[PDB]
Design a protein around this ligand. Sequence first.
Ligand SMILES: OC[C@@H]1O[C@@H](OC[C@@H]2O[C@@H](O)[C@H](O)[C@H]2O)[C@H](O)[C@H]1O
Ligand SMILES: OC[C@@H]1O[C@@H](OC[C@@H]2O[C@@H](O)[C@H](O)[C@H]2O)[C@H](O)[C@H]1O
Ligand SMILES: OC[C@@H]1O[C@@H](OC[C@@H]2O[C@@H](O)[C@H](O)[C@H]2O)[C@H](O)[C@H]1O
Ligand SMILES: OC[C@@H]1O[C@@H](O)[C@H](O)[C@H]1O
Ligand SMILES: [Cl-]
Ligand code: NA
Length: 447
Amino acid sequence: TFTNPLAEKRADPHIFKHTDGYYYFTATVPEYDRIVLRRATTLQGLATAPETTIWTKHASGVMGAHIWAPEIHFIDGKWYVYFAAGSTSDVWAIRMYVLESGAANPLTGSWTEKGQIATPVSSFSLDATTFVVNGVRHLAWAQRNPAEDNNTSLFIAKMANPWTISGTPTEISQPTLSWETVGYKVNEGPAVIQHGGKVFLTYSASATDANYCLGMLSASASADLLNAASWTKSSQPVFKTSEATGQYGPGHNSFTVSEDGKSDILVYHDRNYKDISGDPLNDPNRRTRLQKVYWNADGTPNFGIPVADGVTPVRFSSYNYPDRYIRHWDFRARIEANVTNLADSQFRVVTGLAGSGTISLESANYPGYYLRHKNYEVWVEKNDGSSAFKNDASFSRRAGLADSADGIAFESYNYPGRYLRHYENLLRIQPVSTALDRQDATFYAEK
Ligand SMILES: OC[C@@H]1O[C@@H](OC[C@@H]2O[C@@H](O)[C@H](O)[C@H]2O)[C@H](O)[C@H]1O
Ligand SMILES: OC[C@@H]1O[C@@H](OC[C@@H]2O[C@@H](O)[C@H](O)[C@H]2O)[C@H](O)[C@H]1O
Ligand SMILES: OC[C@@H]1O[C@@H](OC[C@@H]2O[C@@H](O)[C@H](O)[C@H]2O)[C@H](O)[C@H]1O
Ligand SMILES: OC[C@@H]1O[C@@H](O)[C@H](O)[C@H]1O
Ligand SMILES: [Cl-]
Ligand code: NA
């Protein structure tokens, strides 16, 4: 579990997990004047990790304005920071730059400017990221194609070294879809996650307001990534505003991994209100958040929806049907495999509504709704403040009935002796007496 937000007033978050046992976190600060860095042995530990300013804007000329979207990478024994910056003369003449350090600790180490990342076209450029596919390092970034009437398109290239591309860039996406062209016609913030022999390049689209969202390109890892034909663009956003959870304009993401290395983590920013207040560039309230990526059966990532503030939700799978998860459909609770609408299968465990050390299970996509029983059937329904609802939505957490060590079972608070159990895949509360009943009433959280 994570507690969101991770950091207030930090946009364009980048987190890098190093082999020294630390996560390193950099981001865009509201002043746009410097590159900050913090570190911690765990992801949650980053929330209270102190920042060091590692580099500050130049007093005059290039690298002197709009210090935007730093990423930190460890490459061939050295640290590299990728960032964007305009000039004091022309604040909107934004280009891409790199810093290098050979120090073990990048917080305290000394940094060297490696200069601008050169590209054949001299145009607005930012959001450089680097990644390796099958021993070949690539750079992906956002840049204006001057022959297109838009803001930025996505480019990719091979690299000669961490600060220089090799050969010619290829344009692999341009903003053309309705959801990419709201306010401004933008593809920016590329980020790469790899899974199942596929390469998924997420990116941000539209203006940086509530319309901000993630798109995604997909390619095979065996394909020529410099051939635009290798990439397939998702026709709809893969991550967007959720009014229900009060999360607006989620975007400019990166990817990291959990403490145990086994789960992929989506790192992004958003706001908790819709309408921009004041000069859009100057609204400082974007905050950094974390949530686990779930992998669809078809090998594609499922980002779900930006989750409610506070503790993150979990998924509950069945003991006897390990691929089936508790989910709601038309508000009825069932167990089901291959949940495409991920958030129907996410619930957060909260202090019981009926107190006395019980727990309740709050819907991730319908905050304020809970798993509750009525006529012994389990539904996801809105808390109305009634005693009946509170009682019907509270359970005693028990050791699993088929797995005392690792499983979980849920005993009704108002009907002791009855447990949450599935029957013909639908969830009910019933007494447990047989081996099969015990299995039907045992679940696992995050397994
Ligand atoms: O996120 C950076 C950028 O901000 C918005 O574009 C503003 C536009 O960019 C300059 O080239 C022009 O001077 C200014 O009108 C978009 O959200 C994105 O491209
Ligand atoms: O469980 C609540 C909600 O039901 C599912 O959506 C229901 C489905 O959507 C309409 O297009 C159909 O008329 C209706 O059956 C969601 O998956 C879930 O959040
Ligand atoms: O909830 C799934 C399963 O339903 C109940 O079994 C009833 C019937 O018999 C099984 O062979 C089929 O899976 C099902 O249609 C069990 O109580 C429960 O495990
Ligand atoms: O948040 C600062 C800039 O705005 C975003 O649109 C760009 O990706 C980032 O460089
Ligand atoms: Cl589904
Ligand atoms: Na980035």
